[PDB]
């Protein structure tokens, strides 16, 4: 009554096991004195090498020898020997490793920031010079992004229990004493915040400290649904930008080092369909590259058809690797995403290191039949005659940009809209509500980021792309030779009812090595319906086929 | 009298050695009979398997079968029994990783086109969906950036040589027959091209095709010194934004793929500066961060002094890092990147994978002396106190663009103003000249694009980086218990008469493991006074203290 704020130790609380676990058992797996280890590490004091390490005094290379000197002559104090192969460096180097992410804490505190709290990290560590810093560094990098806040002891000069850090911490949240939760693994660095007033809580088990949280902040935090993945604020994303030909740049958001990853979005979408996935595929071992298709977002989008047929869209994408300078990507698609990644593979293999779609079936040109009289026959497809003659289908879709997201994008059990008759009724809204509900895929803020980006250039570049069925299936018919033999996945979407998984059936005639996924209670809108799932499924397979 | 155009064939012309020498190879090998395997390859004629390939019906794995089956039955014609361990993919393999380019010919192109030649690549050539196609991939990117064209036989459904693929060249190069010359390795391909009105040329060995190459452009190619490394348009190149505070942008260029190298510029310089080393550096297999430092081009260039003190810089380079997916980075600098670069290393060790300065030597602050007063000390740095003012340095380095760019980017044996007494004089540019001649380092074109950068936020922002001496400072000692244990390089200039050499020859004391590199007459402006050899010695350094 009333917290605002949330700081959290690292190491036993944020970070499990603790690396003081790994002095106690070192201990017991070599038979030393009880003690020795952690007595080394605490000696000296105030004054001792290891504060001098937490005050960033010196690095942890530094460290290694002076605390080596320590177990030298602790054990020389006992008149005990060390073992022949002795390698300080060795046992810190495991015990950082194996410290992992104690996710139900993490879950914890992005919920409490999520209900208006100003998180923050508060830790005793070190300048980290090791050869394998970089694994840490990593650690260190996926928690701060959920924090407002990450108070290292060796990057302000100031040390658990120094009562001055904690008028540190205050100062820094902006927020008086009694208006912050402190949780910490050891009780000397609970009494000076105590002091000033702080709430506190001594973390033994997670659990348990999570019940004294929630009891303290009045807030489910224990034993919460499964929450979403993270999301991306578009103003903390890296924006790139690329003339791929004289009037045309293509945009795209980057996150991640490792292999190229090219994410291509479907219609009526932009980068931000992929919101969820970007920070997952990054956190796998991927260099994210989420594309702003030509004709969407900040992307050029010149108003000749032509220029969105699916031969010059696919070179053009060569030629964006070709700038940045990457000899292959993996490119993964949705929806015209899906089928124009497949076009890359077919046309230009060498660029592709593998292959991937959701929902959208690679399926061949038919040499005999033009395809215009194809999407006639199905009426599922009755929406894409309307969307042929140019101006009519712009003028509904931009009337009102907020109604047309809201009435897109919605789950399978959502539906607002009739499939068929569009021509018959000439709309795709006709008998569609004017303010829609919100569909629970998607907040107010985020259809407004849609909203947004559709204020540029509209809908005439983006529905360009159904306009080139003649000259796409002339094209295709080219490939018709040929096979696709590099790694390939087929994600199906139970729920997609205008892109059904029966189409996909035939797939491995043409892709005899395609590898599946499907998902059950999955609309068309596959990446904000069903994230968690399809990041599993994408990361699984990015790590056993198109990599190791 | 007078071409215009200059075609060039790929298989034993830009690239070698070639394929069909890895048939002959192997039949001697394999003791085979003299033929067998080019047999089989040409099995077919114009309906055959590799005539298919060539034009893009099939792909080379789909191709592998079809070969095997002609070498089947043309070893069953002589009643040949194939060997026990044959495998048509391994000896393809081998030849196409064995071709690598053919540099006098690749230069030979460069500099025609250099002087007014549309260059263009005629190859027959395959689509590669072989699981080791990143090999030729790279070779293609490599390539392609140096040619207006590349026209590949499997991407237009025509092959050489059929005289309607040289129509298609033709009318690509928006040129008639006798304005283009067509190097080739194979007779039957300039037949056609002879017919139309070519100039062609039997391409046997190398330097006697330049010459009759040569001869006919009448352009000394044979013999030419050693040009210079790829250069950058910056057009063509990706460029990144990104937030790293509420009013604070950074942008960078980008290309490559691999571990992150941050190259960080000096003053007054760009992004721009190291434009001879993001494509060297790129090519060694990294993916190149070329920053505009705060102050510098489109990044921002908030007003404030204080805004541009290490430490707030630093830990702005760590939230670029941070929003841009990295834990890692390879930090190379120069001049004041340098310096900067350093204090990365000894407050962000965990982020630094390596580090690397150009010119900059790692001083340690003076804990007693305040360095103000140093600088009174050495004249050279006399130009340090003319820059504290504010404003009076911005006038004069604004009151001329040109001039002021002209006049700094020399070598040091074309050097215009005099050191020191700076103060004395009241202006870096006193005694020396309004219209500079043109340094040989430079081009007109290239001055002018950092006249272009410069207009947008002028000199406040590059200047205030010499005007946190005293909180630089204070910051730097915090760090003078530490010592420097990750990969480090220091590359010394000659004839740096303000940067001296000198001032690096302790720097081992706290960078036990400092590595070294040295370049004889070399100004100040390494990058582009010896781009040559800076590539060299970052790019072994790199590949051994970098990665592996
Ligand atoms: C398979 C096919 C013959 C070949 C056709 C073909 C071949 C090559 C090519 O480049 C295009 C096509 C058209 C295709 C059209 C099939 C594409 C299937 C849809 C994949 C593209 C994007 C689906 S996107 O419009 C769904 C958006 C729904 C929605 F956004 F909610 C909307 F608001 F309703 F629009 C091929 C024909 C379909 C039926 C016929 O048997
Ligand atoms: C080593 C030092 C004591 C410590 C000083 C120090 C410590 C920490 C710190 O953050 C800054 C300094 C200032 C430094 C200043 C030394 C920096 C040497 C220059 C590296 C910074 C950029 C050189 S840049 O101005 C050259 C541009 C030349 C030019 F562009 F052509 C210009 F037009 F002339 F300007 C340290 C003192 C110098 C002498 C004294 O013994
Ligand atoms: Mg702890
Ligand atoms: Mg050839």
Same mark, same amino acid.
Request: glycine fraction near 6%; proline fraction near 6%; hydrophobic fraction near 40%.
């Given at each position: 009554?009333?917290?605002?704020?949330?700081?959290?130790?690292?190491?036993?609380?944020?970070?499990?096991?603790?690396?003081?676990?790994?002095?106690?058992?070192?201990?017991?797996?070599?038979?030393?004195?009880?003690?020795?280890?952690?007595?080394?590490?605490?000696?000296?004091?105030?004054?001792?090498?290891?504060?001098?390490?937490?005050?960033?005094?010196?690095?942890?290379?530094?460290?290694?020898?002076?605390?080596?000197?320590?177990?030298?002559?602790?054990?020389?104090?006992?008149?005990?020997?060390?073992?022949?192969?002795?390698?300080?460096?060795?046992?810190?180097?495991?015990?950082?490793?194996?410290?992992?992410?104690?996710?139900?804490?993490?879950?914890?505190?992005?919920?409490?920031?999520?209900?208006?709290?100003?998180?923050?990290?508060?830790?005793?560590?070190?300048?980290?010079?090791?050869?394998?810093?970089?694994?840490?560094?990593?650690?260190?990098?996926?928690?701060?992004?959920?924090?407002?806040?990450?108070?290292?002891?060796?990057?302000?000069?100031?040390?658990?229990?120094?009562?001055?850090?904690?008028?540190?911490?205050?100062?820094?949240?902006?927020?008086?004493?009694?208006?912050?939760?402190?949780?910490?693994?050891?009780?000397?660095?609970?009494?000076?915040?105590?002091?000033?007033?702080?709430?506190?809580?001594?973390?033994?088990?997670?659990?348990? &400290? +999570?019940?004294?949280? @929630?009891? #303290?902040?009045?807030?489910?935090? =224990? %034993? $919460? /649904?499964?929450?979403?993945?993270?999301?991306?604020?578009?103003?903390?994303?890296?924006?790139?930008?690329?003339?791929?030909?004289?009037?045309?740049?293509?945009?795209?958001?980057?996150?991640?080092?490792?292999?190229?990853?090219?994410?291509?979005?479907?219609?009526?979408?932009?980068?931000?369909?992929?919101?969820?996935?970007?920070?997952?595929?990054?956190?796998?071992?991927?260099?994210?590259?989420?594309?702003?298709?030509?004709?969407?977002?900040?992307?050029?989008?010149?108003?000749?058809?032509?220029?969105?047929?699916?031969?010059?869209?696919?070179?053009?994408?060569?030629?964006?690797?070709?700038?940045?300078?990457?000899?292959?990507?993996?490119?993964?698609?949705?929806?015209?995403?899906?089928?124009?990644?497949?076009?890359? &593979? +077919?046309?230009?293999? @060498?660029? #592709?290191?593998?292959?991937?779609? =959701? %929902? $959208? /079936?690679?399926?061949?040109?038919?040499?005999?039949?033009?395809?215009?009289?194809?999407?006639?026959?199905?009426?599922?497809?009755?929406?894409?005659?309307?969307?042929?003659?140019?101006?009519?289908?712009?003028?509904?879709?931009?009337?009102?940009?907020?109604?047309?997201?809201?009435?897109?994008?919605?789950?399978?059990?959502?539906?607002?809209?009739?499939?068929?008759?569009?021509?018959?009724?000439?709309?795709?809204?006709?008998?569609?509500?004017?303010?829609?509900?919100?569909?629970?895929?998607?907040?107010?803020?985020?259809?407004?980021?849609?909203?947004?980006?559709?204020?540029?250039?509209?809908?005439?570049?983006?529905?360009?792309?159904?306009?080139?069925?003649?000259?796409?299936?002339?094209?295709?018919?080219?490939?018709?030779?040929?096979?696709?033999?590099?790694?390939?996945?087929?994600?199906?979407?139970?729920?997609?009812?205008?892109?059904?998984?029966?189409?996909?059936?035939?797939?491995?005639?043409?892709?005899?090595?395609?590898?599946?996924?499907?998902?059950?209670?999955?609309?068309?809108?596959?990446?904000?319906?069903?994230?968690?799932?399809?990041?599993?499924?994408?990361?699984?397979?990015?790590?056993?086929?198109?990599?190791?």
């Amino acid at each position: 009554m009333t917290l605002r704020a949330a700081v959290f130790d690292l190491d036993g609380v944020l970070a499990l096991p603790a690396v003081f676990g790994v002095l106690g058992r070192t201990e017991e797996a070599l038979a030393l004195p009880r003690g020795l280890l952690n007595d080394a590490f605490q000696k000296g004091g105030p004054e001792g090498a290891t504060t001098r390490l937490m005050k960033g005094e010196i690095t942890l290379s530094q460290w290694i020898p002076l605390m080596e000197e320590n177990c030298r002559k602790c054990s020389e104090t006992a008149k005990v020997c060390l073992p022949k192969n002795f390698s300080i460096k060795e046992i810190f180097d495991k015990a950082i490793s194996a410290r992992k992410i104690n996710r139900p804490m993490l879950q914890a505190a992005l919920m409490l920031r999520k209900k208006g709290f100003t998180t923050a990290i508060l830790t005793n560590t070190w300048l980290d010079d090791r050869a394998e810093r970089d694994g840490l560094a990593q650690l260190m990098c996926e928690l701060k992004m959920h924090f407002d806040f990450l108070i290292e002891s060796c990057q302000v000069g100031m040390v658990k229990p120094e009562p001055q850090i904690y008028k540190f911490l205050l100062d820094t949240l902006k927020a008086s004493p009694s208006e912050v939760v402190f949780l910490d693994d050891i009780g000397a660095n609970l009494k000076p915040a105590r002091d000033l007033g702080m709430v506190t809580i001594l973390v033994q088990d997670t659990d348990t &400290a +999570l019940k004294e949280l @929630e009891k #303290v902040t009045g807030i489910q935090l =224990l %034993n $919460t /649904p499964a929450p979403l993945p993270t999301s991306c604020n578009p103003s903390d994303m890296s924006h790139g930008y690329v003339t791929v030909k004289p009037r045309v740049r293509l945009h795209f958001v980057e996150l991640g080092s490792g292999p190229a990853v090219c994410l291509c979005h479907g219609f009526p979408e932009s980068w931000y369909s992929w919101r969820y996935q970007i920070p997952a595929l990054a956190q796998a071992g991927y260099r994210v590259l989420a594309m702003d298709m030509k004709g969407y977002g900040e992307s050029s989008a010149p108003p000749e058809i032509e220029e969105y047929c699916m031969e010059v869209l696919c070179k053009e994408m060569v030629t964006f690797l070709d700038k940045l300078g990457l000899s292959q990507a993996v490119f993964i698609g949705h929806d015209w995403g899906g089928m124009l990644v497949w076009y890359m &593979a +077919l046309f230009y293999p @060498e660029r #592709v290191r593998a292959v991937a779609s =959701l %929902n $959208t /079936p690679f399926i061949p040109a038919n040499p005999n039949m033009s395809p215009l009289e194809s999407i006639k026959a199905n009426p599922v497809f009755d929406y894409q005659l309307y969307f042929q003659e140019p101006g009519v289908a712009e003028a509904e879709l931009e009337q009102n940009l907020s109604r047309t997201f809201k009435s897109l994008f919605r789950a399978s059990d959502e539906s607002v809209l009739s499939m068929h008759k569009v021509c018959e009724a000439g709309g795709l809204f006709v008998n569609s509500p004017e303010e829609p509900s919100l569909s629970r895929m998607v907040t107010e803020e985020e259809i407004q980021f849609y909203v947004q980006q559709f204020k540029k250039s509209g809908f005439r570049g983006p529905l360009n792309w159904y306009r080139n069925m003649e000259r796409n299936w002339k094209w295709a018919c080219k490939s018709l030779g040929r096979k696709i033999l590099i790694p390939a996945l087929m994600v199906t979407a139970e729920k997609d009812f205008v892109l059904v998984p029966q189409m996909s059936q035939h797939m491995e005639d043409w892709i005899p090595h395609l590898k599946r996924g499907h998902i059950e209670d999955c609309g068309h809108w596959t990446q904000m319906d069903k994230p968690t799932e399809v990041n599993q499924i994408l990361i699984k397979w990015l790590d056993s086929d198109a990599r190791n």
